[PDB]
Protein backbone atom coordinates (compact mmCIF):
# COMPACT_ATOMS: atom_id res chain seq x y z
CA UNK A 1 0.00 0.00 0.00
CA UNK A 2 2.60 2.59 -0.85
CA UNK A 3 1.40 5.51 -2.92
CA UNK A 4 2.73 5.93 -6.43
CA UNK A 5 5.13 8.64 -5.28
CA UNK A 6 6.41 6.58 -2.34
CA UNK A 7 7.15 3.63 -4.65
CA UNK A 8 8.88 5.92 -7.20
CA UNK A 9 11.14 7.28 -4.43
CA UNK A 10 11.87 3.77 -3.23
CA UNK A 11 12.76 2.78 -6.79
CA UNK A 12 15.32 5.56 -7.01
CA UNK A 13 16.81 4.78 -3.59
CA UNK A 14 17.13 1.10 -4.27
CA UNK A 15 18.41 1.55 -7.81
CA UNK A 16 21.33 3.60 -6.48
CA UNK A 17 22.21 0.99 -3.87
CA UNK A 18 21.88 -1.81 -6.41
CA UNK A 19 24.69 -0.39 -8.54
CA UNK A 20 26.60 1.29 -5.70
CA UNK A 21 26.86 -1.86 -3.64
CA UNK A 22 28.36 -1.87 -0.15
CA UNK A 23 30.92 0.88 -0.78
CA UNK A 24 27.86 3.14 -0.94
CA UNK A 25 28.90 5.18 -4.00
CA UNK A 26 29.01 4.86 -7.80
CA UNK A 27 32.21 4.85 -9.80
CA UNK A 28 32.08 6.09 -13.37
CA UNK A 29 31.82 2.47 -14.53
CA UNK A 30 29.03 1.85 -12.01
CA UNK A 31 27.18 4.85 -13.40
CA UNK A 32 27.70 3.63 -16.96
CA UNK A 33 26.19 0.24 -16.11
CA UNK A 34 23.36 1.87 -14.21
CA UNK A 35 22.48 4.09 -17.20
CA UNK A 36 22.69 1.23 -19.77
CA UNK A 37 20.17 -0.86 -17.76
CA UNK A 38 17.88 1.96 -16.50
CA UNK A 39 17.97 4.33 -19.50
CA UNK A 40 18.39 1.67 -22.21
CA UNK A 41 18.36 3.95 -25.25
CA UNK A 42 20.26 6.75 -23.81
CA UNK A 43 24.07 6.81 -23.82
CA UNK A 44 24.35 5.16 -27.19
CA UNK A 45 21.87 7.59 -28.71
CA UNK A 46 24.21 10.40 -27.71
CA UNK A 47 26.72 10.96 -30.44
CA UNK A 48 29.52 11.01 -27.97
CA UNK A 49 31.45 8.22 -26.36
CA UNK A 50 32.59 10.51 -23.47
CA UNK A 51 28.99 11.25 -22.58
CA UNK A 52 29.08 9.51 -19.21
CA UNK A 53 32.43 11.17 -18.42
CA UNK A 54 30.94 14.60 -19.20
CA UNK A 55 27.84 13.80 -17.20
CA UNK A 56 29.94 12.58 -14.27
CA UNK A 57 31.85 15.87 -14.49
CA UNK A 58 28.64 17.98 -14.28
CA UNK A 59 26.98 16.21 -11.33
CA UNK A 60 26.69 18.34 -8.19
CA UNK A 61 28.90 17.23 -5.30
CA UNK A 62 31.00 15.05 -7.61
CA UNK A 63 34.75 15.63 -7.70
CA UNK A 64 36.98 12.55 -6.86
CA UNK A 65 35.67 9.76 -8.93
CA UNK A 66 32.69 9.07 -6.69
CA UNK A 67 28.99 9.66 -7.21
CA UNK A 68 26.99 9.76 -3.96
CA UNK A 69 23.21 9.58 -3.69
CA UNK A 70 22.68 13.33 -3.74
CA UNK A 71 24.87 13.52 -6.84
CA UNK A 72 22.93 10.62 -8.35
CA UNK A 73 19.70 12.45 -7.63
CA UNK A 74 20.91 15.58 -9.44
CA UNK A 75 21.28 13.41 -12.58
CA UNK A 76 17.66 12.28 -12.24
CA UNK A 77 16.61 15.89 -11.59
CA UNK A 78 18.33 17.08 -14.80
CA UNK A 79 16.83 14.31 -16.91
CA UNK A 80 13.30 14.56 -15.50
CA UNK A 81 13.15 18.32 -15.57
CA UNK A 82 14.26 18.25 -19.22
CA UNK A 83 11.72 15.52 -20.01
CA UNK A 84 9.03 17.65 -18.40
CA UNK A 85 9.91 20.70 -20.43
CA UNK A 86 9.74 18.63 -23.65
CA UNK A 87 6.41 17.18 -22.54
CA UNK A 88 5.00 20.62 -21.81
CA UNK A 89 6.17 22.07 -25.15
CA UNK A 90 5.45 19.16 -27.47
CA UNK A 91 3.04 16.63 -25.93
CA UNK A 92 0.77 17.98 -23.17
CA UNK A 93 -1.63 19.98 -25.37
CA UNK A 94 -1.83 17.16 -27.85
CA UNK A 95 -3.26 14.28 -25.82
CA UNK A 96 -5.37 13.52 -22.71
CA UNK A 97 -3.90 10.08 -22.38
CA UNK A 98 -0.21 9.11 -22.23
CA UNK A 99 1.33 5.62 -22.29
CA UNK A 100 2.86 4.25 -19.10
CA UNK A 101 6.23 2.62 -19.44
CA UNK A 102 6.52 4.47 -22.70
CA UNK A 103 6.47 8.25 -22.64
CA UNK A 104 9.62 9.07 -20.65
CA UNK A 105 11.54 6.49 -22.66
CA UNK A 106 10.34 8.26 -25.80
CA UNK A 107 11.29 11.71 -24.55
CA UNK A 108 14.73 10.65 -23.34
CA UNK A 109 15.56 9.74 -26.97
CA UNK A 110 14.99 13.41 -27.85
CA UNK A 111 17.51 14.75 -25.34
CA UNK A 112 21.18 15.43 -25.59
CA UNK A 113 23.58 16.72 -22.93
CA UNK A 114 24.33 20.43 -23.27
CA UNK B 1 9.58 -1.22 -18.24
CA UNK B 2 12.80 0.26 -16.89
CA UNK B 3 12.00 1.00 -13.24
CA UNK B 4 13.78 4.37 -13.33
CA UNK B 5 11.87 5.53 -16.45
CA UNK B 6 8.68 4.41 -14.76
CA UNK B 7 9.56 6.39 -11.60
CA UNK B 8 10.26 9.55 -13.66
CA UNK B 9 6.87 9.27 -15.36
CA UNK B 10 5.26 8.99 -11.96
CA UNK B 11 6.90 12.20 -10.79
CA UNK B 12 6.09 14.13 -13.96
CA UNK B 13 2.49 13.01 -14.23
CA UNK B 14 1.84 13.40 -10.51
CA UNK B 15 2.81 17.05 -10.80
CA UNK B 16 0.52 17.66 -13.77
CA UNK B 17 -2.40 15.78 -12.26
CA UNK B 18 -2.40 18.21 -9.34
CA UNK B 19 -1.21 21.36 -11.13
CA UNK B 20 -3.78 21.06 -13.94
CA UNK B 21 -3.96 23.33 -16.98
CA UNK B 22 -2.40 26.33 -15.17
CA UNK B 23 0.74 24.19 -14.89
CA UNK B 24 1.75 25.07 -11.35
CA UNK B 25 0.75 24.07 -7.82
CA UNK B 26 -0.83 26.42 -5.30
CA UNK B 27 -0.26 25.93 -1.60
CA UNK B 28 -3.65 24.18 -1.54
CA UNK B 29 -2.73 21.97 -4.53
CA UNK B 30 0.49 20.98 -2.79
CA UNK B 31 -1.41 20.18 0.39
CA UNK B 32 -3.80 17.94 -1.53
CA UNK B 33 -0.90 16.34 -3.43
CA UNK B 34 1.02 15.60 -0.22
CA UNK B 35 -2.06 14.31 1.55
CA UNK B 36 -2.59 11.70 -1.19
CA UNK B 37 1.01 10.92 -2.15
CA UNK B 38 2.62 11.12 1.30
CA UNK B 39 -0.31 9.85 3.37
CA UNK B 40 0.10 10.58 7.07
CA UNK B 41 3.23 12.69 6.45
CA UNK B 42 1.85 16.18 7.12
CA UNK B 43 -0.40 14.95 9.88
CA UNK B 44 2.61 13.33 11.52
CA UNK B 45 4.33 16.71 11.47
CA UNK B 46 3.13 18.38 14.64
CA UNK B 47 2.45 21.54 12.73
CA UNK B 48 -0.57 23.03 11.00
CA UNK B 49 1.86 25.31 9.09
CA UNK B 50 4.15 22.54 7.82
CA UNK B 51 3.10 23.01 4.18
CA UNK B 52 3.54 26.78 4.38
CA UNK B 53 7.00 26.20 5.81
CA UNK B 54 7.84 23.63 3.17
CA UNK B 55 6.91 25.95 0.32
CA UNK B 56 9.09 28.67 1.79
CA UNK B 57 12.05 26.27 1.54
CA UNK B 58 11.43 25.04 -2.01
CA UNK B 59 13.66 26.04 -4.94
CA UNK B 60 12.52 28.84 -7.30
CA UNK B 61 9.39 29.38 -5.18
CA UNK B 62 8.50 33.05 -4.55
CA UNK B 63 5.01 34.12 -5.67
CA UNK B 64 2.71 31.43 -4.32
CA UNK B 65 3.34 29.15 -7.29
CA UNK B 66 5.19 25.80 -7.24
CA UNK B 67 6.57 24.93 -10.72
CA UNK B 68 7.97 21.56 -11.70
CA UNK B 69 11.60 22.11 -10.74
CA UNK B 70 10.35 23.46 -7.39
CA UNK B 71 8.21 20.33 -6.99
CA UNK B 72 11.24 18.26 -7.87
CA UNK B 73 13.30 19.93 -5.11
CA UNK B 74 10.63 18.73 -2.61
CA UNK B 75 10.98 15.16 -3.88
CA UNK B 76 14.77 15.50 -3.76
CA UNK B 77 14.76 16.79 -0.19
CA UNK B 78 12.47 13.99 1.00
CA UNK B 79 14.25 11.25 -0.92
CA UNK B 80 17.74 12.32 0.06
CA UNK B 81 16.65 12.43 3.72
CA UNK B 82 15.00 9.01 3.43
CA UNK B 83 18.23 7.65 1.99
CA UNK B 84 20.36 9.05 4.81
CA UNK B 85 17.94 7.45 7.23
CA UNK B 86 18.02 4.15 5.37
CA UNK B 87 21.83 4.11 5.20
CA UNK B 88 22.08 4.79 8.96
CA UNK B 89 19.27 2.62 10.33
CA UNK B 90 18.19 0.02 7.80
CA UNK B 91 20.87 -0.91 5.21
CA UNK B 92 23.90 -2.45 7.00
CA UNK B 93 22.00 -2.86 10.14
CA UNK B 94 21.16 -5.65 9.23
CA UNK B 95 17.51 -5.59 8.52
CA UNK B 96 14.50 -7.52 9.02
CA UNK B 97 11.87 -4.92 8.35
CA UNK B 98 8.63 -6.45 7.12
CA UNK B 99 6.58 -3.41 6.10
CA UNK B 100 5.18 -3.18 2.57
CA UNK B 101 6.98 0.12 1.92
CA UNK B 102 10.29 1.14 3.48
CA UNK B 103 9.92 4.70 2.17
CA UNK B 104 6.47 4.99 3.79
CA UNK B 105 8.07 3.86 7.09
CA UNK B 106 11.06 6.19 6.83
CA UNK B 107 8.84 9.13 5.95
CA UNK B 108 7.11 8.68 9.31
CA UNK B 109 10.52 9.31 10.94
CA UNK B 110 11.23 12.70 9.23
CA UNK B 111 10.44 16.32 10.14
CA UNK B 112 11.41 19.67 8.57
CA UNK B 113 14.48 21.22 10.24
Amino acid sequence: MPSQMEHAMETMMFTFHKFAGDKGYLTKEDLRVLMEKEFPGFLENQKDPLAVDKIMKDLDQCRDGKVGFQSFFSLIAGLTIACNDYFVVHMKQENLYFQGDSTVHEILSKLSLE
Amino acid sequence: PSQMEHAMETMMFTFHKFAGDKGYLTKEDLRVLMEKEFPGFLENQKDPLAVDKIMKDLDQCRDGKVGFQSFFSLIAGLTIACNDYFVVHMKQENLYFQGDSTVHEILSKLSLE
Binding site: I55, Q61, Y86, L113, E114 | -
Partner: peptide
Protein backbone atom coordinates in the same frame (compact mmCIF):
# COMPACT_ATOMS: atom_id res chain seq x y z
CA UNK C 1 21.95 21.37 -5.78
CA UNK C 2 23.73 21.73 -9.14
CA UNK C 3 21.85 20.03 -11.94
CA UNK C 4 23.16 18.92 -15.32
CA UNK C 5 21.39 20.53 -18.27
CA UNK C 6 19.96 18.39 -21.04
CA UNK C 7 18.56 20.02 -24.22
CA UNK C 8 16.11 19.06 -27.00
Amino acid sequence: MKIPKFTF
